[PDB]
């Protein structure tokens, strides 16, 4: 994070992580769609022609004011397909909080676990520890018929009873819940 005392601005970086097609970019598109002009910048989306994220999405968001400092949250999503790993590592630099977006389809459970170990690895390799940073997990795609139960995703993905949110990103369900949860964990960390 970066605090400009002169301009009274608190800046925090939040990165959405998870496997390919799991819904990271849909989270940001929803947030952008529903936020008044006066609290958001422009949504940058570096994507392929089939809309897969190729480098990152970026959305700057202002969440109000705490003790007369404006809060600016810099939201990123990574490219989730395995072979973008080199680009994916770049986005984690200076991350203040992480949202891990998991796809609830049984056919993507192993992609979820692979992506989660990839987030642990990538953080360790630049000197962070997922067990020690503000972290929430989103079980996205709860609408789909082939979605596994919340309890089986907890067993596969969530060992420290990290805050977990059910979402259906395209309708917005769970999206602002997830953002509010990691944003407050980040702000609680600074308070310490």
């Amino acid at each position: 994070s970066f605090i400009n005392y002169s301009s009274r601005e608190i800046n925090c970086k939040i990165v959405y992580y998870g496997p390919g097609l799991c819904g990271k970019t849909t989270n940001l598109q929803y947030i952008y769609n529903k936020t008044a002009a006066e609290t958001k910048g422009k949504l940058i989306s570096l994507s392929t022609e089939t809309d897969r994220t190729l480098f990152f999405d970026f959305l700057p968001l202002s969440l109000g004011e705490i003790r007369g400092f404006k809060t600016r949250f810099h939201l990123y999503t990574v490219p989730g397909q395995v072979f973008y790993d080199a680009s994916r590592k770049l986005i984690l630099k200076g991350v203040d909080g992480v949202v891990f977006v998991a796809d609830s389809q049984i056919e993507r459970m192993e992609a979820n676990m692979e992506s989660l170990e990839n987030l642990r690895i990538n953080l360790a390799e630049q000197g962070y520890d997922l067990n020690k940073i503000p972290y929430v997990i989103q079980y996205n795609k709860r609408d789909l018929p082939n979605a596994v139960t919340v309890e089986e995703m907890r067993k596969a993905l969530n060992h420290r009873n990290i805050p977990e949110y059910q979402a259906v990103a395209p309708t917005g369900v769970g999206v602002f819940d997830t953002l509010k949860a990691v944003a407050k964990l980040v702000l609680t960390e600074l308070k310490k």
Binding site: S1, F2, I3, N4, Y5, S6, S7, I10, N11, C12, K13, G41, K42, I44, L46, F55, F56, F58, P60, L63, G64, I66, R67, G68, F69, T71, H74, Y76, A86, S87, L90, K93, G94, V95, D96, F176, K180, A183, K184, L187, T188, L190, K191, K192
Partner: protein, 145 residues
């Protein structure tokens, strides 16, 4: 995140370096961005232009070049140049976590830009050479949205 703070002591000098370069090198815009994407300062005709997006693409570009330089066994390319027919753009790494960016009209020779940039960068490392949370409570946080 490394908890980083900037008091108006060093902010005011950094802004001064920037508006020097836009006036002298006839830059259309100037700005300073952390490697992690955080915009630190801008300067120039930043009306009608999104310096927050610019800072984010810049740090993404520099980080991708960073990894490529490392892949072909080199160090981070100290700067990058990108000519345009109308407006052109030059950037250089200032220190270990900062990037200075200048885009200018091509009615301003490249030689004059890399001149003022030799000094402004050297000036910036001279500046780098030099609490809201204490009274905060969890209602301040919970009441944010």
């Amino acid at each position: 995140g490394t908890q980083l703070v900037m008091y108006e002591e060093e902010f005011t000098k950094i802004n001064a370096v920037c508006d020097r370069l836009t006036k002298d090198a006839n830059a259309k815009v100037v700005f300073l961005v952390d490697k992690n994407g955080q915009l630190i300062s801008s300067a120039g005709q930043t009306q009608n232009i999104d310096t927050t997006s610019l800072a984010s693409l810049t740090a993404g570009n520099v980080a991708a070049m960073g990894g490529l330089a490392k892949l072909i066994g080199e160090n981070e390319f100290p700067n990058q140049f990108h000519e345009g027919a109308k407006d052109s753009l030059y950037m250089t790494i200032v220190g270990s976590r900062v990037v200075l960016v200048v885009i200018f009209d091509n009615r301003t020779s490249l030689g004059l830009v890399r001149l003022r940039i030799k000094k402004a960068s050297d000036e910036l490392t001279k500046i780098f050479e030099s609490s809201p949370f204490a009274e905060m409570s969890d209602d301040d946080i919970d009441n944010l949205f």
